[PDB]
């Protein structure tokens with residue numbers, strides 16, 4: 001039993017809700033919130049910009065130190081940093097950016113990072129400002145993640161389409 005509420009169950013381990021991940025994180029304070037990061041951890045917009053703003057820029061300050069020490073992430077890769085006021089930890093995951101020509105096959109590699117955590121609150125990856133089709137992203141998620149994932153879908157129109165086309 002966990003503190004997530006109002007989710008539709010899609011599979012044994014995948015749950016979905018029309019919600020702003022920032023509001024879900026503040027309410028639930030999960031162990032892990034996933035950020036839809038880029039390789040530079042520059043949290044400018046979309047999920048990342050919204051999460052960072054909710055931390056009063058502390059996420060960005062921490063991220064800049066991470067990059068100065070370690071260099072950029074790989075597309076498909078991740079790092080665990082603080083969740084600040086939103087969660088215990090933030091798993092920053094880089095999905096491929098289709099607008100940059102990055103290989104959509106890397107979306108599966110991106111979702112594999114979720115399997116290192118028993119329960120996560122997450123957005124879809126590679127959709128939003130990253131350019132990919134969210135319907136495809138949901139299928140890759142369901143076919144890749146084996147741990148318990150709670151997906152917050154920002155757009156109501158999209159949520160209804162993801163649900164209706166699922167089975």
Ligand SMILES: OC[C@@H]1CCCN1c1ncnc2[nH]ccc12
Nearest residue numbers: 020021046047050123127128154
């Ligand atoms: O595929 C990611 C979707 C599409 C673009 C933004 N995004 C979000 N998902 C969930 N919670 C969110 N809060 C703020 C933005 C946001």
Ligand SMILES: [Cl-]
Nearest residue numbers: 046047128129
């Ligand atoms: Cl986004």
